[PDB]
């Protein structure tokens, strides 16, 4: 049975909620993103009306099979109606196609659902600058003051700075990302541009990507993994056994690996700097854990809600305990005390 805080009320409407059943009202369902935790129920014999981006839409029809009768992509920054309701979907600063949804009720109450988020002051100049959120469903991934993390950019120039210096001291060396979901391309596709190199994939990688709406991307992507200098494998095998095996199979064409784990938060973020960040190396392997966030950090979070001044805040995440949930609603407290509303 679904759970209260993915139902929008006073609507026929929820959000992430595949895998209840049929949920009792529901006459649409919205997917903010591409990720499983949110998406786990979808398939082919799926039969209700989906709202989501484009770019989510075309991972549904490629990705899970989901018939095209049954997809309703909408365009960002647009007012549309669905099922009698004005709706907006912004960008989320998440992964590729992640939204927020805004939602203006039929009796005047105006709800912002952020999906999963990484918040940013550009949110500040959106289309949310215009009126009063009543009502906020929030990504609280991230919300202690203990998970701090640098800029998307500062982790970028690290990699890069990295896999240069040693690329260009050993040609031999190869590079390896990992991944187990979409998000985060930017770590290997900023890798592979100073290399002058295409990322090599697997088939079934390459199929995902190719629905991302990425500028370019026949340009930067191919499955030719003997044509490439960065190859990407699936995050359980970023390991030294697993490293080990996949530079046999590279037939002598290198004699040294270079790797990256991004990862969100870990503990050694509460003790070391990006520029001091080293790996971990058994002889000829190294592997870099990479703290490349894709969620708001406190701060981020902090600062956008008490810009924004809800009425009501309903977390989305780490709802399940109840040291969770009390530490939660103490730091909301503290953000309406010290900003005034
Ligand atoms: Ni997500």
Known sequence: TCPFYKKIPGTGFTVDAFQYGVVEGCTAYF???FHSDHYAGLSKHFTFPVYCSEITGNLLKNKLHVQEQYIHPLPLDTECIVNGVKVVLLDANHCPGAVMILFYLPNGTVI?????FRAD???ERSLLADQKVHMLYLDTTYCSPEYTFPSQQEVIRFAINTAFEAVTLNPHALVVCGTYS???????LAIADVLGSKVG????????????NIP???SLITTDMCSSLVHLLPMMQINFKGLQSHLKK?????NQILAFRPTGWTHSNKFTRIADVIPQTK????IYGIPYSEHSSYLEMKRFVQWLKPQKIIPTVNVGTWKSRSTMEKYFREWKLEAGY
Do not use: A
């Open 31 to 33: 997917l903010t993103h």
């Open 112 to 116: 912002l659902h952020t999906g999963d």
């Open 121 to 123: 002051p550009s949110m």
């Open 182 to 188: 979409i998000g985060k391309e930017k770590v290997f």
């Open 201 to 212: 994939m697997s088939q079934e990688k390459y199929k995902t990507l190719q629905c991302l």
């Open 216 to 218: 370019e991307i026949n």
């Open 250 to 254: 590279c037939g002598g064409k290198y």
């Open 283 to 286: 002889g000829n392997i190294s």
